[PDB]
Amino acid sequence: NTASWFTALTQHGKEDLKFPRGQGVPINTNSSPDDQIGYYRRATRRIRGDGKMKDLSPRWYFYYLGTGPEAGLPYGANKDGIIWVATEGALNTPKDHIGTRNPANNAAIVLQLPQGTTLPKGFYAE
Amino acid sequence: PNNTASWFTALTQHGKEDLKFPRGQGVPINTNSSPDDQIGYYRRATRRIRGDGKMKDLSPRWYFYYLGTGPEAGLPYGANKDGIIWVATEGALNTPKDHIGTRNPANNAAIVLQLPQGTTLPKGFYAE
Amino acid sequence: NNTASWFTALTQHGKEDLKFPRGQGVPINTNSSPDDQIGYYRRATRRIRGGDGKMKDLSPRWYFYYLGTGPEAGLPYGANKDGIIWVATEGALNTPKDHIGTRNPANNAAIVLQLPQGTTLPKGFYAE
Amino acid sequence: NNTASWFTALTQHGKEDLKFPRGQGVPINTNSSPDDQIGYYRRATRRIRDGKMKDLSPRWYFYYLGTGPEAGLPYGANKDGIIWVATEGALNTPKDHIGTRNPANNAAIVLQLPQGTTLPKGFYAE
Numbered sequence: 001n002t003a004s005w006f007t008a009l010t011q012h013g014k015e016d017l018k019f020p021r022g023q024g025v026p027i028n029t030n031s032s033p034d035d036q037i038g039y040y041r042r043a044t045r046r047i048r049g050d051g052k053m054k055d056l057s058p059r060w061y062f063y064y065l066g067t068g069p070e071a072g073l074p075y076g077a078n079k080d081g082i083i084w085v086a087t088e089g090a091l092n093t094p095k096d097h098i099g100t101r102n103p104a105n106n107a108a109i110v111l112q113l114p115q116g117t118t119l120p121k122g123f124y125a126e
Numbered sequence: 127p128n129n130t131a132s133w134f135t136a137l138t139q140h141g142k143e144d145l146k147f148p149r150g151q152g153v154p155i156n157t158n159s160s161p162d163d164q165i166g167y168y169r170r171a172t173r174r175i176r177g178d179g180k181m182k183d184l185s186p187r188w189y190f191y192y193l194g195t196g197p198e199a200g201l202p203y204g205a206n207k208d209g210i211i212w213v214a215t216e217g218a219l220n221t222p223k224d225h226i227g228t229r230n231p232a233n234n235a236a237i238v239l240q241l242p243q244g245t246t247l248p249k250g251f252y253a254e
Numbered sequence: 255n256n257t258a259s260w261f262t263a264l265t266q267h268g269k270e271d272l273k274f275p276r277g278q279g280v281p282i283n284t285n286s287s288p289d290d291q292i293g294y295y296r297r298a299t300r301r302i303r304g305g306d307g308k309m310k311d312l313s314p315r316w317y318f319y320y321l322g323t324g325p326e327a328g329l330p331y332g333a334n335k336d337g338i339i340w341v342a343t344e345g346a347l348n349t350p351k352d353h354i355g356t357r358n359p360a361n362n363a364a365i366v367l368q369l370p371q372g373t374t375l376p377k378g379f380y381a382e
Numbered sequence: 383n384n385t386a387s388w389f390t391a392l393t394q395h396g397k398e399d400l401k402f403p404r405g406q407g408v409p410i411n412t413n414s415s416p417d418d419q420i421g422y423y424r425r426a427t428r429r430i431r432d433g434k435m436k437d438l439s440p441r442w443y444f445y446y447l448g449t450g451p452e453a454g455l456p457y458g459a460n461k462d463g464i465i466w467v468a469t470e471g472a473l474n475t476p477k478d479h480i481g482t483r484n485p486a487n488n489a490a491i492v493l494q495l496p497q498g499t500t501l502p503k504g505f506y507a508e
């Protein structure tokens with residue numbers, strides 16, 4: 001059982017998450033500038049108040065390049081539910097030394113975006 | 127700064143009943159806490175949202191706060207107030223849990239809420 | 255002998271594999287104890303001859319089995335195996351559940367798969 | 383189906399082949415139990431193209447007992463390119479519950495040995 005190192009973004013709108021070029025990577029003080037590159041993956045949630053199934057707001061979780069459920073996807077690969085982000089000067093190499101989080105040992109880092117970042121309409125952290 | 131929060135994620139109600147747990151159950155599991163500390167209250171949070179152009183009432187959410195902490199930190203166990211329901215396990219202490227306090231959401235993530243062994247939640251409630 | 259899940263299958267009508275948040279996803283079984291609430295879903299894929307005469311896959315079915323029972327009775331909880339996903343209810347014992355075992359359809363109907371109130375499912379799956 | 387070691391490789395830059403003392407050599411995996419700390423390293427030499435053929439430094443990959451390209455080998459099995467290792471407290475049972483890694487959805491774990499572990503000469507975790 002693995003997990004993102006960070007908490008999620010919640011989507012309230014109808015369109016997929018998308019950051020402008022050069023933003024989107026959560027702050028992690030234990031990472032280096034080389035490490036600042038990854039993807040957000042959508043997690044869908046469904047529940048049962050009597051209209052059978054109700055789709056809740058999707059959530060989007062960040063994973064460093066080369067880790068997570070899509071560890072094998074190269075940066076920029078087109079896949080539904082996957083969107084790519086990177087900071088200027090980050091290296092296009094797998095971040096196996098960071099890997100993913102095991103919740104039995106570490107709670108998620110509160111997701112925080114760098115000063116001046118623009119979240120698209122409808123998206124909120126926590 | 128100046129951000130207070132429940133230590134746990136919310137129980138959302140899509141049914142019509144207020145939250146209620148049979149006496150002895152209903153406090154979420156917190157591996158960083160003792161059985162003395164298993165006492166507190168859920169508190170109701172209302173919300174609206176915008177479908178579009180429609181002042182759309184949303185599903186109530188309930189948040190757990192340990193006894194003596196949170197928005198009703200001053201209220202004693204069992205005090206009657208609309209939007210507040212009480213919960214505790216057997217053998218928990220009727221003492222304020224100031225050492226646990228509330229969560230700083232900038233500093234710590236919420237604990238996803240899970241009722242302990244053999245605890246069901248009323249119809250129309252779900253964790254998220 | 256040869257046996258069956260105690261429960262009817264969950265069919266995957268979406269691209270997403272079956273998954274549940276920790277604590278969630280064990281089928282409701284009034285004949286069962288909170289100690290027993292631990293197991294796995296196993297994907298069963300069927301092929302069929304299509305109208306063009308080529309084999310083609312049907313929608314995958316996911317069958318629940320209590321821990322220590324069924325086709326993967328040898329696996330400990332959390333084992334890594336394609337087509338196997340794990341579920342456990344808060345406070346279930348990580349012990350093999352050989353006392354409840356698997357079903358003989360000769361003398362036992364399957365229990366209609368029902369998930370506890372407030373269970374979050376992935377898209378493509380439906381909770382009756 | 384086609385899988386990979388859970389860990390990055392040990393590269394043999396020298397002429398010593400792997401060998402650890404009693405109870406040493408199992409990589410640090412916090413998603414495993416004292417029961418599981420048992421398995422083998424398997425050599426993987428690669429060949430590269432002045433226009434002749436060329437060996438590179440052999441890469442040793444760790445596979446838990448019961449898993450990998452030699453999953454049907456019991457502990458202590460004698461085979462060229464196979465070295466065996468176990469921690470005190472481990473079980474001599476196939477660890478199919480760990481299995482091997484699909485790189486599509488899991489990054490490699492950087493191979494790390496516990497403090498005090500002794501390595502032969504010429505061996506490095508790149």
Ligand SMILES: CN(C)Cc1c[nH]c2ccc(OCc3ccccc3)cc12
Pocket residue numbers: 001002102103104331332333334388411413414480
């Ligand atoms: C939150 N967890 C602690 C749940 C967990 C309990 N017992 C496990 C055994 C294996 C596992 O994941 C398999 C695995 C992971 C990394 C490397 C090899 C194999 C996960 C778990």
